[PDB]
Every structure is written in structure tokens, then in C-alpha cells.
Design a protein around this ligand. Structure first.
Ligand SMILES: CCCCCCCCCCCCC/C=C/[C@H](O)[C@H](N)CO
Lengths: 58, 297, 245, 50, 58
């Protein structure tokens, strides 16, 4: 089970579970990702965040 | 040695990226909480301001009276692997007995995945991608029958000598990877790594590769990204004489281990050229369907 | 408060009284390149206050039949001041930006502007009308300079991509009823730690009027639009003689 | 038996009357207190809203 | 042995033994069920149950 660390997703925060039979790590299966989202990075990219209950402009 | 106050207290050199947002796990859809009526002044979640550039954050519980729903709907199917790890057609190579396209029994196919709309629209939703690949070669005659023929596929990285004939010396493949397979066999399938000199493939490149005067002849350089030129794929029929059957080869690509950056709007016009976002100027059509009036369905 | 703001950097200052907050591109501030990500070996230069300042490039007129304009970065600054000198003398380049758009009118004027930042904004051609011709945009269209360029088909943004989905990019609205300015902060966007400042353009800035300007006869008919911008955390490397283009 | 959250947390059935005001004894008229001049901004009891 | 929990019999009272080689759980074998019955739910669906030895109507 000693193989090269040469997949496209090495040096990433999330870890997969995959099956490999060769010494090169990019030959493995796609596997399962981890379910994490950051919707604010596109939906609410403001400097000073404001609460729902108030008026955005005051 | 730092002795002046403006250098001692300086903020030059901060290499860490300040992140205003963080990622939180979300295996299922969000639950709904119980809500009741509200009759008060000063606290209004219905009114927003779209000028700021932020999506409105009023929820169900703040607008209507709702019940409690324990949402257990998974979000697993919309991930990048689940969306992209499906095979699709990206190229065809034709090997006729007589013709003007590939009359010698060999062909060279430059590897690019912008040749077919189904795959191109999916891949061009983003600007940068980094992934592994899985190629499959399905070969058959124009009538679709399978025949006893031996073929050779060769991967030619950029800088290697391209074959010029069926009897070229490049087919000794002392270093290039190659595949010998028969048409009676199952399709050939190989795995390809990430090969870019950069950290990602970019499908859009606003620039030119070289300096100099940008005249008419030196105008096609716009949008031409050298980092997406991944070489050539060469095919031939093994033998010293001409083959007996005309063959057609279809190539199917399946992505895996995917990462993507910078989403952009989806294409809404018909494609015309490869690696070229040109569109038919005189035949512009709307994105969607139309209706007779705005007050009727 | 929130409607009033003052932006100061270097030896310049911008004040406003009808702001609409500040948008930070992709929720990230501009930053320098780290030692684990850098690939070139020579020591880069960081001129600091002489290049990180607000530059006012030009002024455009908003009319009832205007279609829109776009600017390319850092092509607008490749020939302005010390920043332009450094960009000409050096091979490599790395910086972010802070964009401020000025447009003011009265309380009796109406109209809306969409200000957006689209990275790698490749401009497509009309392909000869019918579409059988393989044309490419000329120099004045791909790299208009600091004078900008006018859109010909704003519904497709000259690239066959619908404008209704441009809000997925970092953006702000200029609605004359509410605000009179917009600010977007863009970090460094690229797949390379450093890139050329003359051959490569990182992003493009789009200003398209979605709601037409309208006023009653007698009010002021000349409504200008102004672009102001400041590089942030600039680096340069690969020093040689200067090159014009 | 109540098992759903919108019935458990429901406010149906509140028979008591919420009173914003209460009665206070007043056998005589109200006294007058000593007052002096005031010269300041932000605090104006003369201006109202009918 | 890390797979999705996406078979048709998830969220059920009875457990099976099955063999799978893929990451999707609906590709496995049928396996063995558990032998439980509730015949009264169709044969004796009365409100007040009565003993065998007595008269059903008295
Ligand atoms: C004997 C093996 C023969 C099979 C050769 C297949 C190798 C394929 C080369 C790598 C393909 C990379 C995927 C696409 C990269 C670039 O972004 C595209 N060319 C886009 O134009």
C-alpha cells in the first residue's frame, strides 16, 4: 500500500476515501467528498455584516 | 536593522489572506423552525436594499407563519465530482479507405475538449479547473460492425516528433506511452494526470503569448493559452500495407478529483469556433422563451 | 453610520455621503505572495506609498440611449505615473485593486447602473454577421487603454454570455434614488503567483445602464460617470530596460 | 396529547387580558416642583407629534 | 467499506446481510430478510379482542 502522492487533490483541506491498485495515486476512483459549503463568499461578500431584522441602509 | 517608526510599525509583508467567510458542514437541507405572528415597529426583515450587492436574507420564519419540518434531504449529488464525473464525447477520428481527410491510414488529433457543446457548456461554467482524466476509445466501422483489426494509439507530449506517415520511425515509442489493442477487444481505457505548468487549466485567457506589434497576421494570438496545449493523440493501423476496413474512433472523457474556481455566466448562444467565444452577430436570440403579453400566461 | 464613508490610502482621500457599504471580492483582502507559493528567486520590489494611491482615469457621459462601457486592468494604468513606470521596467507583476465609481444626479433624476468585475473577460467578435468568418477583436477593442470602450451588444456583453447572470460576479448597483457611488475591493486573481502586466489582463470592469436615464425638460442634462482606482499590495520583479508595449 | 411543535409551543387559549396601564391612587391634585432655566440641544419637550 | 446509505430499505426496522463492491448501497445483493409476521393486522383487526373459548356475540 506504498504509493506515490500524486493526485490532483493533494494539498487540500478535505479528505477522500478511494480504491487504488497501482503505485500512482491519480489512478484511483473518484470516491466520496466531504459536504462543506461557504455560501457567504458569493451571497454576502460585504465588509460590515448586518442583521436580518434591521434596515440594511440607515 | 529597523530603526524608524514607520518601518518598525509597517504592515508590509503580510502574506496571509484575511478570510471574512468560513466553510461549515451541511450534509442535509436546513430545518424549519416554528414561527408566530409579530406586530411591532422598528424591526422589519421584509425590506431590503439590493444596491449593496448582497442577497436578501429574509427567511420563512420572518415573513409567514410556519410549522417545524425536520428536513433530511441530502446535498451529496450536487458536488463537483457528482456533477462532472460522467463520460461524454469529445473527439472523433475518421480513417477512411479512400478520401482526402486521412488517406494514409494515420491521423493526429490535438487534445482539446472545446469541440463539442454538451461538454463545453458544462466545463465553461468555471474559469479555472484542476482535475484528473479518464479516456476511453470506442472503435467501429461506419456500419457499426466489429472487425479483426489491430490499432496503435500513441500519446505525443509537446516537443516530441509528430509522425508524418504510417511507416515513420516515431512509432518505435521508446519513451512515448502507447496502446496496442484490437477492435474485437473491449474499449481501451487509460488514466491521465494533471499536466499543466500552472496550478489549473483556464478556459478563458485575456492576453497574448508574445510581445511585438499586433498586426493582422499576428491577431489569432488572442485567447490562445499555451498552458492548455497538452500535445497530440496519434492513431494508425499496424501494418506495412493498406488496411481492409474503414474505421471511426470516438473518444470519451471522464473527469475526477476536481477543483474549480471563479464561476462565470453560462453560454446562451450557439458556438462557432474552437477556443474562440465568437457568436453570430446578426442572429442574436434571447436566453429563454417569449410570450404575447406580460399580463397573461 | 453606513451611508457616509472616507477612503484614504497613500497621499489621496475620497469622501462620500451616499455610500452603500463596501464589497470585498470573494470575501478576501489583497495580500502579498508567501514563501511557499513564490517560484522566482530574485527579491521583488515593494514601492509602497508611491504606487498605492488613487488614480482618476477619465469621465464618461451618461445619456438616455447609452449602452455601456468596459475597462481592462491593469491596462488602464500601464502608462500612468510611478506605477506605469514600474510596470514597464519590470517583467513580473502582482497586485489587487480598490475601485470607486462616481455618478451623481438630483432627486428628480432616475436610472440604475450595474457595476461588476468579471475576471478573464475575453471579448468575442460578431464573426462577420452570418458567422462563417473567423474574426478576432482588434487592438482598440481587446485593449482599449485608459479611455475605455463602448459595448456593441450589451445583452450578450460581446461574448455570448447573458447579462442577467452578471451578478454572480462581485458587483454593486448605482441607483440614483439611493446612492451615488460604488466600491469593490478585488484581491489578486490568477493561477500564477506572478504574471506580466503588459501581455496579460486579469479582469475587466463593466458599467451597463439597466434602467434608462430619465428626467423632465429643464433639469441638468449632463450626467457624467467617473472611475477612480488604487492598486493595493503591489510587487514587481525581473528588472530590465523599459518596453513600450 | 400534543406532540407537534407548533401545538406544543402554541399561544392559543390565553384568556388573560394583557393590560398596558394600571390604576394609581390620586386623592388630591398633583403638586408642582421647582424648575429652572435650561439651555441645551437635543432635549426638547415642547415639540410633540399629534 | 465506506459507502453511501442509499438503499430502498434504509430507515426500516429490519436489517439485512448483503454484499457490495461499489460506493452506492443499492447495488448490493438481495440478501436475507428477518422472519417476522403480524397476521392480526389483517385477520383480527377488531377494537376489543375476544377469547377463543367464549361466544363472539353475547
Ligand atoms: C496511450 C495513451 C493515449 C491516450 C492519451 C490521452 C492523454 C490526454 C492528455 C491530457 C488531457 C488533459 C485534459 C484537457 C486539458 C486542456 O485543458 C484541454 N486541451 C483544453 O483545451
Amino acid at each position: 500500500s506504498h504509493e506515490n502522492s500524486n493526485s490532483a487533490t493533494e494539498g487540500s483541506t478535505i479528505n477522500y476515501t478511494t480504491i487504488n491498485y497501482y503505485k500512482d495515486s491519480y489512478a484511483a476512483t473518484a470516491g466520496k467528498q466531504s459536504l462543506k459549503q461557504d455560501p457567504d463568499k458569493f451571497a454576502n461578500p460585504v465588509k460590515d455584516i448586518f442583521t436580518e431584522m434591521a434596515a440594511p441602509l440607515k | 536593522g529597523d530603526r524608524v517608526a514607520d518601518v518598525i510599525e509597517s504592515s508590509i509583508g503580510d502574506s496571509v489572506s484575511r478570510a471574512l467567510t468560513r466553510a461549515l458542514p451541511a450534509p442535509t437541507g436546513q430545518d424549519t423552525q416554528v414561527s408566530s405572528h409579530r406586530l411591532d415597529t422598528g424591526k422589519v426583515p421584509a425590506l431590503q436594499a439590493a444596491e449593496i450587492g448582497a442577497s436578501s436574507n429574509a427567511s420563512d420564519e420572518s415573513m409567514i407563519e410556519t410549522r417545524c419540518v425536520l428536513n433530511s434531504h441530502s446535498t451529496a449529488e450536487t458536488t463537483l465530482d457528482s456533477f462532472f464525473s460522467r463520460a461524454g464525447l469529445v473527439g472523433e477520428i475518421d480513417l477512411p479507405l479512400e478520401g482526402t481527410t486521412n488517406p494514409n491510414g494515420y491521423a493526429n488529433w490535438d487534445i482539446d475538449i472545446t469541440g463539442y457543446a454538451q461538454m463545453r457548456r458544462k466545463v465553461e461554467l468555471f474559469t479555472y479547473m484542476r482535475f484528473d482524466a479518464e479516456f476511453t476509445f470506442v472503435a467501429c466501422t461506419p456500419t457499426g460492425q466489429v472487425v479483426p483489426q489491430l490499432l496503435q494509439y500513441m500519446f505525443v507530449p509537446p516537443g516530441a516528433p509528430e509522425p508524418d506517415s504510417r511507416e515513420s520511425l516515431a512509432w518505435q515509442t521508446a519513451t512515448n506511452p502507447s496502446v496496442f489493442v484490437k477492435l474485437s477487444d473491449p474499449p481501451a481505457q487509460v488514466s491521465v494526470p494533471f499536466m499543466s505548468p500552472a496550478s489549473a487549466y483556464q478556459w478563458f485567457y485575456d492576453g497574448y503569448p508574445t510581445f511585438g506589434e499586433h498586426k493582422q497576421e499576428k491577431d489569432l494570438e488572442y485567447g490562445a493559452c499555451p498552458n492548455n496545449m497538452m500535445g497530440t493523440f496519434s492513431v494508425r493501423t499496424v501494418g506495412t500495407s493498406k488496411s481492409k476496413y474503414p474505421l471511426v474512433i470516438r473518444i470519451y472523457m471522464r473527469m475526477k478529483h476536481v477543483r474549480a474556481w471563479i464561476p462565470r455566466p453560462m453560454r446562451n448562444q450557439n458556438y462557432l469556433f474552437k477556443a474562440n467565444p465568437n457568436y453570430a452577430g446578426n442572429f442574436i436570440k434571447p436566453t429563454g422563451a417569449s410570450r404575447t403579453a406580460i399580463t397573461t400566461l | 453610520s453606513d451611508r457616509v464613508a472616507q477612503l484614504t490610502i497613500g497621499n489621496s482621500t475620497i469622501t462620500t455621503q451616499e455610500a452603500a457599504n463596501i464589497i470585498v471580492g470573494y470575501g478576501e483582502w489583497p495580500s502579498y505572495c508567501s514563501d511557499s507559493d513564490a517560484t522566482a528567486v530574485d527579491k521583488p520590489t515593494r514601492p509602497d506609498v508611491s504606487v498605492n494611491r488613487f488614480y482618476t482615469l477619465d469621465t464618461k457621459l451618461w445619456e438616455k440611449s447609452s449602452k455601456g462601457w468596459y475597462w481592462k486592468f491593469p491596462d488602464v494604468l500601464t502608462e500612468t505615473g510611478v506605477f506605469g513606470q514600474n510596470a514597464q521596467f519590470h517583467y513580473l507583476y502582482r497586485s489587487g485593486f480598490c475601485i470607486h465609481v462616481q455618478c451623481n444626479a438630483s432627486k428628480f433624476h432616475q436610472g440604475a447602473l450595474l457595476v461588476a468585475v468579471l475576471p478573464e473577460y475575453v471579448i468575442g467578435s460578431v464573426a462577420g454577421g452570418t458567422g462563417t468568418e473567423d474574426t478576432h477583436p482588434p487592438y482598440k477593442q481587446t485593449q482599449p487603454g485608459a479611455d475605455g470602450f463602448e459595448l456593441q451588444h450589451p445583452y450578450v456583453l460581446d461574448a455570448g454570455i447573458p447579462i442577467s447572470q452578471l451578478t454572480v460576479c462581485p458587483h454593486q448597483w448605482i441607483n440614483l434614488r439611493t446612492n451615488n457611488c460604488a466600491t469593490i475591493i478585488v484581491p489578486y486573481i490568477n493561477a500564477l503567483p506572478f504574471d506580466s502586466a503588459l501581455n496579460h489582463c486579469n479582469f475587466g470592469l463593466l458599467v451597463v445602464p439597466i434602467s434608462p436615464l430619465d428626467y423632465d425638460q429643464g433639469a441638468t442634462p449632463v450626467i457624467p460617470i467617473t472611475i477612480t482606482l488604487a492598486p493595493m499590495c503591489s510587487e514587481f520583479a525581473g528588472l530590465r530596460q523599459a518596453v513600450t508595449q
